[PDB]
Amino acid sequence: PDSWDKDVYPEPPRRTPAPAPQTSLPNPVTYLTKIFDLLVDRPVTLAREFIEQQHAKNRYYYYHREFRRVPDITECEEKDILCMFEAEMQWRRDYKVDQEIVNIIQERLKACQQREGESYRQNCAKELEQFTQVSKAFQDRYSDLGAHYSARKCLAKQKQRMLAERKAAKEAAAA
Amino acid sequence: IARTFYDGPEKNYEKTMAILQIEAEKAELRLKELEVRRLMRARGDGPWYQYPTIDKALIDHSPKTTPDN
Ligand SMILES: CCCCCCCCCCCCCCCCC[C@@H](O)O[C@H](CO[C@H](O)CCCCCCCCCCCCCCC)COP(=O)(O)OCC[N+](C)(C)C
């Protein structure tokens, strides 16, 4: 339905064929479907209608919490505990959001593999490539930090990688 | 439950900031005090570690029965 964003959770246009009977025999599946409909789906729908009638009477909402952007750990001087505290809390919240991004991408991948049936190896390549890009980025940022991770250790990992990349590019320029 | 038993995150956040400031000030004060004690014990110029010497008020500055003291 419209409850969730179809841009973050997309799906193809859902092509389904029309029934083309070839025999005089009655299809027991469709009769069972009519029986199921008129014994199960209608009482359940009525119950839900009443429940939502009672819901509409008392309507209240909640709001997603928004967080400002505070200075990160790079612009905190070495022993300033308050800047360090706020930077570390911000880094932790960002780590949580990145975990959820990888989760969304993995959900897409799984849904594609199930949906595409026998053709998943070709029809889910974009989902696989998207996951590969996200996984590579997430791995660079947080892998090998260990328990007792922190923004300072993430910064040290990034700086080590940046040094290696700079030196590699410099010796490639001499080639 | 949140309304009856708990508070918002800002209270715990800023209480943590206060706690952290107190603790960090105490830590730097402890280190500085150790350094001050080291210097005062090595040099003896500070108020601390003052070892008694003889009171100059005990000396008798009167003619001493011979001219050369
Ligand atoms: C609606 C029905 C379906 C859902 C049921 C919901 C289940 C909830 C009931 C379970 C009880 C919760 C356990 C109590 C733990 C909370 C303890 C503490 O955190 O609560 C204090 C608050 O005190 C509460 O009153 C807790 C007291 C609960 C004591 C339980 C005793 C029950 C024993 C049952 C005896 C019944 C009779 C016995 C006959 C012999 C908080 O202190 P406070 O300083 O405010 O903090 C500031 C927060 N402010 C700003 C919001 C005010």
Side-chain angles (χ1 to χ4, degrees):
Chain A
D2 53 339
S3 69
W4 70 82
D5 202 296
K6 300 304 291 290
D7 279 321
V8 192
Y9 311 99
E11 53 188 41
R14 190 178 202 82
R15 329 197 308 166
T16 181
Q22 204 75 78
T23 184
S24 65
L25 281 197
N27 187 357
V29 165
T30 80
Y31 179 80
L32 282 170
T33 293
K34 291 184 181 181
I35 298 299
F36 174 93
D37 196 4
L38 190 147
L39 290 178
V40 182
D41 180 41
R42 279 168 90 164
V44 161
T45 305
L46 294 189
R48 178 61 163 179
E49 292 206 330
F50 169 86
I51 289 166
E52 187 175 0
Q53 291 175 1
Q54 308 299 307
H55 284 324
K57 268 133 61 66
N58 171 32
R59 155 93 49 237
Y60 63 121
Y61 345 70
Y62 69 118
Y63 327 87
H64 173 78
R65 183 181 281 280
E66 305 290 346
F67 281 98
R68 286 208 271 277
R69 178 67 34 181
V70 296
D72 60 352
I73 200 71
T74 72
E75 52 189 352
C76 303
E77 63 182 1
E78 185 176 359
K79 287 306 173 175
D80 194 3
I81 201 71
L82 303 157
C83 294
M84 283 186 69
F85 170 63
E86 284 183 344
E88 168 78 11
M89 294 292 104
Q90 169 162 93
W91 180 88
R92 290 178 147 275
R93 276 186 257 102
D94 286 0
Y95 188 15
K96 282 169 189 186
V97 172
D98 284 2
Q99 289 158 11
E100 284 303 313
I101 286 172
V102 189
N103 279 333
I104 289 167
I105 304 303
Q106 278 170 315
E107 280 167 43
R108 282 186 190 173
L109 186 65
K110 297 176 208 169
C112 190
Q113 203 277 345
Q114 165 65 19
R115 188 194 317 117
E116 290 313 305
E118 273 305 329
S119 297
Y120 68 92
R121 185 46 83 206
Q122 166 181 11
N123 280 358
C124 295
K126 60 176 331 315
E127 274 79 12
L128 175 46
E129 66 90 21
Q130 280 185 14
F131 178 66
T132 301
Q133 158 208 176
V134 179
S135 168
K136 184 56 173 28
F138 188 94
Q139 193 186 53
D140 277 341
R141 288 190 174 195
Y142 314 107
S143 287
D144 307 2
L145 287 187
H148 304 308
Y149 50 66
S150 58
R152 288 177 42 212
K153 291 176 190 194
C154 187
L155 185 48
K157 196 200 182 188
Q158 175 177 168
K159 278 193 195 175
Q160 176 191 264
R161 188 170 39 84
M162 290 167 76
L163 287 170
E165 290 173 340
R166 183 173 78 176
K167 187 259 282 185
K170 184 176 73 68
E171 280 146 37
Chain B
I1 287 188
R3 166 171 65 251
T4 307
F5 300 105
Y6 299 103
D7 315 318
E10 67 274 3
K11 175 170 192 268
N12 180 252
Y13 198 86
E14 288 155 343
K15 282 178 50 178
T16 297
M17 285 184 69
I19 286 163
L20 281 181
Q21 178 181 69
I22 293 172
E23 294 300 324
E25 285 175 341
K26 287 207 284 211
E28 54 93 12
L29 277 173
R30 288 191 193 105
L31 288 172
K32 175 187 299 184
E33 174 181 355
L34 276 179
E35 188 54 30
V36 159
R37 285 178 66 191
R38 193 191 62 90
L39 291 173
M40 281 210 206
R41 193 165 191 161
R43 297 165 177 172
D45 56 6
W48 304 344
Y49 299 102
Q50 290 302 327
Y51 297 118
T53 54
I54 287 152
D55 190 354
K56 74 187 289 186
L58 293 168
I59 305 179
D60 180 21
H61 308 279
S62 63
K64 294 292 189 335
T65 213
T66 41
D68 305 331
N69 298 33

XYZ file of all heavy atoms in Angstrom, chain A residues 65 81-82 85-86 89 93, chain B residues 9 13 16-17 20-21 24:
122
model
N 11.977 12.187 15.400
C 12.897 13.130 16.018
C 14.008 13.544 15.062
O 14.627 12.704 14.417
C 13.488 12.572 17.314
C 14.390 13.554 18.037
C 14.976 12.972 19.309
N 14.031 12.987 20.421
C 13.774 14.058 21.164
N 14.386 15.203 20.909
N 12.903 13.987 22.160
N 36.776 17.294 26.314
C 35.906 16.140 26.536
C 34.484 16.390 26.043
O 33.784 15.446 25.677
C 35.932 15.734 28.019
C 35.478 14.284 28.186
C 35.059 16.653 28.845
C 36.465 13.274 27.692
N 34.035 17.643 25.989
C 32.657 17.901 25.588
C 32.482 17.809 24.078
O 31.523 17.193 23.590
C 32.221 19.268 26.098
C 32.372 19.393 27.610
C 32.496 20.834 28.011
C 31.190 18.745 28.291
N 32.646 14.201 23.338
C 31.418 13.493 23.673
C 30.365 13.679 22.592
O 29.752 12.707 22.127
C 30.884 13.969 25.020
C 29.510 13.470 25.331
C 29.268 12.120 25.477
C 28.458 14.347 25.472
C 28.004 11.660 25.762
C 27.197 13.889 25.757
C 26.968 12.547 25.901
N 30.136 14.925 22.181
C 29.096 15.163 21.186
C 29.470 14.558 19.838
O 28.613 13.992 19.147
C 28.818 16.655 21.064
C 28.010 17.191 22.223
C 27.663 18.649 22.066
O 28.294 19.317 21.230
O 26.750 19.125 22.770
N 28.829 10.744 20.105
C 27.411 10.422 20.012
C 26.912 10.563 18.580
O 26.130 9.728 18.097
C 26.603 11.312 20.949
C 26.885 11.084 22.410
S 26.314 9.488 23.007
C 27.852 8.588 23.104
N 25.308 7.555 16.174
C 24.038 7.638 15.462
C 24.221 7.406 13.963
O 23.414 6.712 13.329
C 23.384 8.989 15.725
C 22.591 9.034 17.000
C 21.851 10.340 17.142
N 22.513 11.233 18.084
C 23.264 12.266 17.730
N 23.452 12.542 16.452
N 23.831 13.018 18.652
N 15.694 12.467 26.284
C 17.129 12.186 26.158
C 18.016 13.372 26.484
O 19.191 13.168 26.810
C 17.275 11.772 24.692
C 16.127 12.411 24.011
C 15.003 12.388 24.989
N 21.632 13.375 28.428
C 22.719 13.902 27.606
C 23.503 14.989 28.339
O 24.735 14.926 28.459
C 22.124 14.444 26.311
C 23.078 14.643 25.165
C 23.380 13.604 24.312
C 23.636 15.884 24.912
C 24.228 13.783 23.256
C 24.488 16.071 23.858
C 24.781 15.016 23.033
O 25.628 15.183 21.972
N 25.295 13.920 31.439
C 26.541 13.276 31.052
C 27.617 14.304 30.736
O 28.783 14.119 31.093
C 26.305 12.366 29.850
O 25.403 11.322 30.213
C 27.603 11.758 29.374
N 27.244 15.389 30.062
C 28.218 16.445 29.783
C 28.776 17.041 31.075
O 29.986 17.265 31.204
C 27.586 17.524 28.913
C 27.422 17.106 27.471
S 26.792 18.403 26.409
C 28.183 19.523 26.381
N 31.110 14.513 32.746
C 32.374 14.407 32.028
C 33.271 15.593 32.318
O 34.484 15.428 32.492
C 32.119 14.295 30.532
C 31.690 12.933 30.006
C 31.499 13.012 28.515
C 32.716 11.891 30.356
N 32.703 16.797 32.369
C 33.519 17.968 32.677
C 34.127 17.859 34.072
O 35.323 18.115 34.261
C 32.694 19.242 32.557
C 33.485 20.476 32.910
C 32.673 21.735 32.827
O 31.771 21.959 33.630
N 32.993 22.576 31.859
N 36.971 15.191 34.023
C 38.174 15.580 33.299
C 38.942 16.661 34.048
O 40.183 16.655 34.072
C 37.803 16.049 31.896
